[PDB]
Ligand binder design. Structure first.
Ligand SMILES: Nc1ncnc2c1ncn2[C@@H]1O[C@H](COP(=O)(O)O)[C@@H](O)[C@H]1O
Length: 241
């Protein structure tokens, strides 16, 4: 996924890592096979693991939510490793925020709507679609020249992400994930984007409940703004087995 995000000043802080067993970490997002593959190539290439996982302790369980690190986690498991260096966050601090991403596309709206309807969704023209999506009352608003409601909740949201990645792979559309919906509207005015998909961002509380149910979001659903990026670390791959 091509990304476009606000140039956020986030400070690097020197926080120590701790090794946490991979089987104590819970994903909140579906994996992206290419990102998994790129991590595997990179870590096996250097033999240094330099970027700690960011975790949050799951209330009432001997388990951690993966805040950042899904492909590191999954890649290390696929290689046979058993742990990863991790930074434990104060996740429910006001200092940690969660937003979402806004998938936007240049291409044919009609092929996209057909394919959405092919996976059991509907796409209803609706001038209040964006207001409804922002309140969490529908799955996605689809907004460009016309405004459309896509009814539902999580299952319908995952079909939308799934259809778009299929059509991206097929090269029937160009797909950019925007950090901010207004940057997708700043660029749409310029003529670079036709349409943007708008959902209500998940809350921290919802993220944690989802993993407690053993469920996951589509890729590019959560967008965490953290109080810091951990400084880089000096851990050998051989230490993780
Ligand atoms: N040798 C490495 N050690 C640790 N992380 C890496 C290495 N090479 C690439 N990465 C990161 O692995 C991450 C894989 O995606 P994710 O774990 O979902 O954040 C990317 O953010 C890369 O920066």
């Amino acid at each position: 996924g091509v990304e476009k995000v606000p140039k956020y000043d986030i400070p690097t802080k020197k926080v120590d890592y701790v090794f946490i067993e991979l089987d104590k970490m819970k994903p909140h997002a579906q994996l992206v096979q290419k990102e998994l593959e790129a991590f595997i190539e990179s870590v096996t290439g250097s033999g240094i693991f330099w970027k700690p996982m960011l975790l949050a302790k799951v209330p009432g369980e001997d388990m951690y939510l993966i805040v950042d690190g899904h492909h590191r986690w999954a890649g290390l498991q696929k290689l046979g490793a058993k742990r990863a260096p991790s930074v434990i966050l104060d996740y429910f601090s006001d200092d940690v925020k969660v937003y979402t991403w806004y998938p936007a596309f240049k291409g044919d709206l009609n092929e996209v709507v057909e394919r959405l309807k092919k996976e059991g969704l509907e796409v209803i023209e609706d001038p209040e679609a964006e207001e409804k999506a922002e309140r969490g009352e529908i799955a996605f608003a689809l907004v460009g020249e016309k405004s459309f409601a896509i009814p539902g909740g999580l299952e319908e949201q995952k079909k939308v992400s799934k259809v778009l990645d299929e059509m991206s792979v097929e090269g029937k559309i160009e797909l950019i994930y925007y950090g901010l919906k207004e940057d997708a509207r700043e660029d749409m005015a310029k003529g670079e984007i036709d349409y943007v998909f708008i959902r209500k961002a998940p809350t921290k509380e919802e993220v944690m409940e989802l993993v407690k149910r053993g469920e996951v979001y589509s890729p590019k659903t959560t967008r965490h703004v953290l109080p810091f990026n951990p400084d880089k670390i000096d851990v050998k791959l051989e230490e993780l087995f």
